[PDB]
Amino acid sequence: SDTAEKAQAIAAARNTFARDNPVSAGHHERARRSMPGGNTRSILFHRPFPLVIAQGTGSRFQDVDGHAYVNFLGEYTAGLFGHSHPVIRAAVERALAVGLNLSTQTENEALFAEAVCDRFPSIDLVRFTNSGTEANLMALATATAITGRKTVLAFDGGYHGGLLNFASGHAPTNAPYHVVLGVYNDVEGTADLLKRHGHDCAAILVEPMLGAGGCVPAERAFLDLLRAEASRCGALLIFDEVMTSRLSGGGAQEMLGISADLTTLGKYIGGGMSFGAFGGRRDLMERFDPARDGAFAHAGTFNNNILTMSAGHAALTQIYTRQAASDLSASGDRFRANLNRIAVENQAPLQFTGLGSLGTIHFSRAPIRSAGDVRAADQQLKELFFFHMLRKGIYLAPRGMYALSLEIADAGRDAFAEALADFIGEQRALL
């Protein structure tokens, strides 16, 4: 499906971006001297070079060349509060007043843990980590240590952190858990794998919607299979809700009425501060009670850091309440529906998939149900879309994902929709 016409368009788009952004280009050359590819977070890199941002307030930011954008990326769902939320700021100020690096417990960690347990229906007890990666690693540590088993079932296209990256199948850098990969949403194939491996299965690890892998919702039949089979064979079902937890007050599990044995959390819950968490069934999580004989150990210098504890409690109780989550997801559904309406109205061979305030463009009108479907959609048009949106002052992920923050308003949503319509018109010959 790769064509020379599209490759020529991409070359032209990259060239225009380069010409537009010489200050960012200068930054990149300098950054390469201290970091591999001038990079410390792989997903931030794109050709010909990434933007460097100077400053941002609310939903807007400005690059080092002075161009302004509305930020539709929202820190891959962590940046729910925009760039300068006054309640987050107040929480940071309160944290400084309590004191940094106090080397001890404060009440703030307990208050934050209570806020998490209150709203997530399957989390009876929780522990905080410093990232979604650590949360998922600790969930696997819990499952393997409790069951004494080695096999982990996960899914092709699934992303669970820097050491558990299955976005393109097995990565040589992944931690060497014995992972068997299924096809997302594939009931019969997955049922077969669970017949074969169920006996040695410590855990099933699954996102209720592929996040990085394309905003691909799980189907109920698929999740029902995993819940029934985990219970049958004695594996722990782990829902990775690092992204999906935002979709309702109680995440995907509240929406579905399906409870995982363990749940991992990340992104926005710490108020935009470093954050992850793992929690779940009381009888599983109690294995970490340090007063218990044979307790599992889980240290971590910054687990209880005052900034995350303070900003996280503010995030859940003062800003993104359960009602706020319902409201934002409804807003996101209307937004996604409008984008899809624009595509249909214009006979465009594209769609936006997702749930609530999360969505990704795919250049296909086939059902998008697994990693294979995402990969089969037109990747060249996806790149062209990214550069087009940038030229229109709209910033979203290179991979075509948006994650609406609470600061996105009518003006931003209107601008996105108009820019989409303009893309369809201007790139008609390639569509």
Ligand X SMILES: Cc1ncc(COP(=O)(O)O)c(CN[C@@H](CC(=O)O)c2ccccc2)c1O
Nearer to ligand X, 198 or 266 (CB): 266
CB of 422 to ligand X, least distance (A): 26
Residue 171 binding result from ligand X, a second copy, none, given CB thresholds of 5 to 8 Å by partner type: a second copy
Residue 292 binding result from a second copy, ligand X, none, given CB thresholds of 5 to 8 Å by partner type: a second copy
Residues 157/209, Cβ–Cβ less than 8 Å: no
**Residue from 61, 69, 72, 76 binding ligand X (CB under 6 A):** 76
Q: Which tokens go with 43?
A: 């997903």
**Residue from 4, 221, 299, 429 binding ligand X (CB under 6 A):** 299
| 104 is known to lie in a ligand binding site | no
Residue 4 binding result from ligand X, a second copy, none, given CB thresholds of 5 to 8 Å by partner type: none
415 CB contacts (<8 Å, ≥6 apart)?
70, 392, 393, 394
Tell me which residue of 151, 211, 222 sits closest to 184, measured CA to CA: 222
SS3 (DSSP) at 300: coil
Residue 128 binding result from a second copy, ligand X, none, given CB thresholds of 5 to 8 Å by partner type: a second copy
CB of 414 to ligand X, least distance (A): 27
| 301 is known to lie in a ligand binding site | yes
SS3 (DSSP) at 215: coil
Neighbours of 345 (CB within 10 A): 10
Q: Which tokens go with 369?
A: 């149900």
Q: Which tokens go with 143?
A: 């499952």
CB of 110 to ligand X, least distance (A): 17
Q: Which stretch in 228-236, 297-305, 360-368, 369-377 sits in contact with ligand X by CB under 6 A?
A: 297-305
| 267 is known to lie in a ligand binding site | yes
Residue 296 binding result from a second copy, ligand X, none, given CB thresholds of 5 to 8 Å by partner type: a second copy
C-alpha 5: how far from chain center:
33
Q: Which stretch in 5-13, 137-145, 155-163, 361-369 sits in contact with ligand X by CB under 6 A?
A: 155-163
Report how many residues bind ligand X under the rule CB under 6 A.
22
| 359 is known to lie in a ligand binding site | no
Nearer to a second copy, 76 or 352 (CB): 76
CB of 199 to ligand X, least distance (A): 27
Residue 293 binding result from ligand X, a second copy, none, given CB thresholds of 5 to 8 Å by partner type: none
| 272 is known to lie in a ligand binding site | no
Residues 59/383, Cβ–Cβ less than 8 Å: no
CB of 64 to ligand X, least distance (A): 21
* CA gap 59, 83 in Å, rounded: 6
Burial of 178-207, coded b for 16+ CB within 10 Å and e otherwise, reads ebebbbbbbeeebbebbeebbebbbbbbbb
Name residue 241's beta-bridge partners: none
301 near ligand X, rule: CB under 6 A: yes
Long-range CB contact pairs, 45-49, < 8 A, 24+: 46/386, 46/398, 47/14, 48/14, 48/15, 48/17, 48/18, 49/18, 49/21, 49/24, 49/25
| 365 is known to lie in a ligand binding site | no
| 132 is known to lie in a ligand binding site | yes
Q: Which tokens go with 191?
A: 């049922």
**Residues in contact with ligand X, shown as a per-residue x/- string from 238 to 277 under the rule CB under 6 A:** --x-xx----------------------x---------x-
300 near ligand X, rule: CB under 6 A: yes
Residue 195 binding result from a second copy, ligand X, none, given CB thresholds of 5 to 8 Å by partner type: none
Amino acid letter, 186 = D
Q: CA dist 76 to 215, 242, 249, 277, Å? A: 11, 10, 19, 17
Binding site, annotated residues for pyridoxal 5'-phosphate: 132-133, 301
Binding site, annotated residues for 2-oxoglutarate: 41, 267, 300, 399
Residues of the shown chain interacting with ligand X in the complex, contacts defined by CB under 6 A: 41, 43, 76, 131-133, 136, 159-161, 207, 211-212, 240, 242-243, 266, 276, 299-302
